[PDB]
Assembly symmetry: C2
Homo-oligomer: 222 residues x 2
């Protein structure tokens, strides 16, 4: 292969948030490089009546709340990037995010558990490697690229649904998802997050991750 993925970057943003564009660009650049699992969660607290993006959801906002609690904070803001489900940083701080992810890796707090995903014809197969502890197998479904009327703006990896498909206990496992899931991934893609939780059950460190894009086109040079 080559160099393993550096980590997970979950950006909470909104088209109604004026200071978010810079962070949106940051994420787009990281997704283009493909060295991180990047996700964009549009929050609903920026909607009022006009500039209400059809990409936001209450569920996305609730996830940012889960992180707020787990991180011991007393509030939320946008743009906010959550790294490896372990810490937060300004969404536009590209240098900070990569330096943070590197710091995690150097401490063995990176993506230590192998996670693989692929289409098994009319089903989705998720392969998880061996490790220690317990974690949920979380799947975040997103559209690859979606344009919205401002003119027109483009957003990438906008999550529209998140679901837990099983539990990992340290043992290697394979989870098979039905055609209904295949159809959803085909709308863009999905990210598999092997995520632990704290005592309260809120989202915590992500110890493994993978992205499966709906487009399975193999690009080759001869």
């Amino acid at each position: 292969a080559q160099e393993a993925v550096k980590g997970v970057v979950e950006l909470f943003t909104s088209q109604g948030c004026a200071s978010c564009p810079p962070a949106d660009e940051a994420l787009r650049k990281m997704i283009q490089k493909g060295d991180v699992v990047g996700l964009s969660y549009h929050v609903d607290y920026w909607n009022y009546l006009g500039w209400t993006d059809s990409l936001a959801s209450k569920e996305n906002t609730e996830r940012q709340y889960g992180y707020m609690r787990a991180l011991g904070r007393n509030g939320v803001y946008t743009p906010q990037a959550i790294l490896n489900g372990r810490d937060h940083v300004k969404g536009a701080d590209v240098r900070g995010i990569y330096d943070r992810l590197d710091a995690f890796k150097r401490e063995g707090q990176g993506l230590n558990v192998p996670v693989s995903s692929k289409f098994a014809g009319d089903e989705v197969e998720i392969d998880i490697g061996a490790g220690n502890g317990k974690a949920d197998v979380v799947v975040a479904y997103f559209t690859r690229e979606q344009t919205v009327d401002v003119k027109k703006m483009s957003y990438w990896h906008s999550v529209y649904d998140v679901q837990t498909v099983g539990m990992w206990d340290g043992s290697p496992m394979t989870v098979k998802l039905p055609a209904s899931v295949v159809a959803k991934v085909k709308k863009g893609g999905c990210a598999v997050l092997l995520q632990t939780a704290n005592a309260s059950g809120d989202p915590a460190a992500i110890v493994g991750a993978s992205i499966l894009l709906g487009n399975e086109t193999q690009l080759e040079h001869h």
Copy 2:
């Protein structure tokens, strides 16, 4: 009469918020003094599964979002107190809130429009005085005092419903509410807020306010 009410204090808090108790006490003290219209809005972003107060609501959280936008901020936190619908301050900063309200009054940004409320037998009557501009006649219904299991903690003026009952255009007006409203106020009380809105329609400066308690007991000394 005597000295007019100093202003409106809207506290966003939650029993799931560990740093909120101090702010809750602050509000209780101001409500006891009765020189301000005090309201407590329990937010829902501190609920997870256990310490989920039955006093929180999505609507309350949305109101804090409305204020976030109007105030030009990019996030929310608890405990947060909104003063006269014009600015925010730490919920526990008792000195700051009163000094802020005083600063508003000295600038003629206090409660300049008279607002009165009373029970008309089986109906609720709200009397609004003359002024300039446009504002919604907002009614926030609350329980006077509610205890929740931690032991047991007590919360005051916990808002459980907010509704606009009419529009003020600067002209003196009287709004009559049905028996259904009387029943709700009797569950605790209500606060009438003559509130303006910004260009986006979000909650802005409150130019008049009044509280009507369900208990209409007249205390006299002879």
